[PDB]
């Protein structure tokens, strides 16, 4: 017997599970359309070189990579943002800006689940915090569309520029900044000792300064540290003013501990969370204004975006009882009275489908009662019995499942 289980860390989606996944994806697609984003895609297989960032990132450390027969170093993508930038870099000046692009790629890791789907939303060519505002609103909109409220979830927001100043002023060379963010991202996960030790290895005074600024609880307190008109203060203020104007003020808040784990974030960063403190981050993103420059863009291209995985959100929705099983449905099941009626039933099936209805025909030889049972099992709205006596009169028998003779023309 063949192995029935899927490959290690990978999920099967039989129809029941697929309906749940489709319920989620339908929201991702619907939200992107509502917000005027355009779909794109790229190959799950990318060059390994695309992800070599040398910053100690979990995402690049846990890369599902291999070598081809032809000796090329490839990887099943651990994230989408590098593929997006590749695409953008390829287009150059032909790309009209601003651009708002989205996708729902399967992304991979190797270390535990080894694959997940991740809704990606990115705004390209927008310098101002208006981009981050729209992105955060889009994530909130998706969560609201799924049945959650601002009592269930929120989005924590910060700017890496605050920390950038502290690292720069303390005297640390800026090439260590991305490594620092990556390490400080571990704070909530591991003891402050371990995190303190990691920064020591990187290269005590400056470490204290980092720690203090992470734990500042309000924006006023940040403004006391760096000034009321520091770059980050005005941007965060504008960000909250705009989100409030859109009507999502209750969904967002400031949190100085939020840095995210990716090397490339330069500005505002954010992450979604459940207000019971039970789950990992629901989504995460930020501004990354230098990535395209590091890829070789002759001109700086401002960018911002987020990823929103398919797994944590599902656990939250299940906890909140927002993912009831939604059984399969079909409009019509056409039932031949017997096999002599099959040709006529097929003509009827054609008509129903011609009208835009979803319809089955009983394919096996079976008794009328069992055909009605099958009709119930598949969630048919209507059973259409095609029998000789009614057929003679230009009719079929129609029975609403949630048996009257009806002229063919009146079926639809």
Ligand X SMILES: N[C@@H](Cc1c[nH]c[nH+]1)C(=O)O
Ligand Y SMILES: Nc1ccc2oc(=O)ccc2c1
Distance in angstroms (rounded) separating the CA atoms of residues 153 and 251: 7
Quote the least distance from Cβ 135 to ligand X, whole Å.
9
CA distance 38 to 288: 20
Q: Which residue is nearest to ligand X (CB)?
A: 305
Count Cα neighbours of 52 within 13 Å in the Cβ-side half-sphere. Answer: 6
Q: Is 264 one of the annotated binding-site residues?
A: yes
Task: By CB under 6 A, name the one of 20, 55, 59, 162 that touches ligand Y.
Answer: 59
Q: Environment class of residue 3 by beta-carbon count within 10 Å: exposed (0-12), middle (13-18) or buried (19+)?
A: exposed
Residue 134 or 332 having the CB closest to ligand X: 134
Q: Say which entry of a copy of itself, ligand Y, ligand X, none residue 96 contacts (CB below 5 to 8 A, set by partner kind).
A: a copy of itself
Site for ligand X, residues 290 to 319, rule: CB under 6 A: 305-307
CB contact set of 266 (below 8 Å; sequence gap of 6+): 160, 161, 286, 287, 288, 289, 290
Q: According to the binding rule CB under 6 A, does residue 79 interact with ligand X?
A: yes
In the complex, minimum distance from the CB of residue 278 to ligand Y, in angstroms, rounded to a whole number: 17
Smaller CB separation from ligand Y, 105 or 154: 105
- Residue 140: in which H helix or E strand, if any? helix 130-145
Q: Which residues in 2-41 contact ligand Y (CB under 6 A)?
A: none
Rounded CA separation 310/251 (Å): 20
- 109 touching ligand Y, by CB under 6 A: yes
110's contact among ligand Y, ligand X, a copy of itself, none, with CB below 5 to 8 A by partner kind, is: a copy of itself
* Chain residues 102-131 in contact with ligand X, contact rule CB under 6 A: 120, 122
CB contact at 8 A, 309 and 283: yes
Question: Is residue 228 a known part of a binding site?
Answer: no
Closer residue to ligand X (CB): 75 or 335 = 75
Specify the residue for token string 């992105």. 135
Phi–psi pair at 133, nearest 5 degrees: -55, -55
> Residue 39 Cβ, how far from a copy of itself at the closest point, in Å?
5
For a copy of itself, which residue of 330, 368, 405, 408 counts as binding (CB under 8 A)? 330
Q: Which of residues 242-301 bind ligand X (CB under 6 A)?
A: 262, 284-285, 288
Interaxial angle between packed helices 231-246 and 219-226, expressed in degrees from 0 to 180 and rounded to the nearest 10:
160
CB of 116 to ligand Y, least distance (A): 4
Count residues near ligand X (CB under 6 A).
11
For a copy of itself, the binding residue among 170, 190, 200, 245 (CB under 8 A) is 245
d(CA 162, CA 269): 11
Q: Does 132 bind ligand X (CB under 6 A)?
A: no
Contacts of 31 (CB under 8 A, 6+ apart): 138, 141, 142, 145
Q: Is 350 in the site for ligand Y (CB under 6 A)?
A: no
Cα 227 from Cα 276, distance rounded (Å): 34
Kindly tell me which residue out of 27, 75, 78, 263 binds ligand Y, with binding defined by CB under 6 A. Answer: 78
Q: Pick from ligand X, ligand Y, a copy of itself, none: which does 246 bind, CB < 5 to 8 A by kind?
A: a copy of itself
CA 388 and chain centroid, separation: 53
Strands of the 73-76 sheet, one edge to the other:
45-47, 73-76, 64-67
Q: Which of residues 287-306 bind a copy of itself (CB under 8 A)?
A: 295-296
Asked if 15 interacts with a copy of itself (CB under 8 A), we say yes
Query: Minimal CA–CA distance to 320: which of 205, 196, 149?
Result: 149
Q: Which residue ranges make up the site for ligand X (CB under 6 A)?
A: 79, 81, 120, 122, 262, 284-285, 288, 305-307
Feature table: binding site for L-histidine: 79-81, 109, 118, 122, 260, 264-265
Feature table: binding site: 79-81, 109, 118, 122, 260, 264-265
């Amino acid at each position: 017997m063949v192995e029935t289980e899927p490959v290690q860390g990978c999920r099967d989606f039989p129809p029941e599970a697929m309906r749940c996944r489709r319920h989620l994806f339908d929201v991702f697609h619907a939200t992107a359309k509502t917000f005027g984003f355009e779909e794109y895609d790229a190959p799950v297989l990318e060059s390994e070189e695309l992800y070599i960032r040398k910053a100690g990132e979990e995402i690049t450390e846990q890369m599902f990579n291999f070598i081809t027969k032809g000796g090329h170093r490839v990887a099943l993508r651990p994230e989408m943002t590098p593929s997006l930038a590749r695409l953008l870099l390829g287009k150059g000046r032909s790309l009209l800006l601003p651009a708002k692009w989205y996708s729902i790629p399967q992304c991979w890791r190797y270390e535990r689940r080894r694959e997940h789907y991740q809704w990606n939303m990115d705004i390209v060519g927008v310098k101002s915090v208006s981009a981050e505002v729209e992105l955060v609103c889009a994530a909130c909109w998706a969560m609201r569309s799924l049945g959650l409220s601002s009592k269930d979830v929120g989005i924590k927001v910060n700017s890496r520029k605050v920390l950038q100043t502290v690292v720069e002023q303390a005297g640390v060379t800026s090439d260590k900044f991305a490594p620092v963010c990556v390490i400080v991202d571990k704070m909530e996960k591991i003891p402050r000792e371990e995190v303190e030790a990691q920064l020591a290895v990187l290269g005590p005074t400056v470490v204290d300064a980092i720690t203090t600024t992470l734990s500042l609880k309000s924006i006023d307190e940040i403004a006391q540290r760096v000034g009321e008109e520091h770059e980050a203060v005005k941007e965060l203020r504008q960000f909250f003013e705009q989100v409030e104007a859109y009507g999502y003020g209750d969904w967002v808040l400031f949190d100085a501990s939020v840095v995210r784990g990716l090397a490339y974030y330069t500005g505002i960063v954010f992450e979604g969370f459940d207000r019971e403190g039970k789950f990992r981050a629901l989504c995460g993103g930020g501004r990354y204004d230098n990535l395209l420059t590091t890829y070789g863009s002759p001109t700086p291209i401002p960018c911002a975006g987020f990823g929103f995985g398919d797994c944590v959100i599902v656990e939250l929705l299940q906890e909140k009882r927002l993912l009831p099983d939604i059984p399969h449905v079909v409009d019509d099941v056409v039932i031949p009275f017997d096999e002599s009626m099959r040709p006529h039933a097929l003509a009827v099936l054609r008509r129903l489908r011609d009208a835009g209805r979803s319809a089955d025909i009983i394919l096996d030889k079976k008794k009328v009662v069992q055909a009605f049972n099958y009709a119930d099992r598949v969630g048919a709205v209507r059973a259409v019995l095609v029998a000789p006596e009614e057929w003679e009169r230009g009719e079929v028998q129609v029975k609403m499942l949630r048996g009257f003779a009806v002229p063919l023309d009146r079926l639809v």
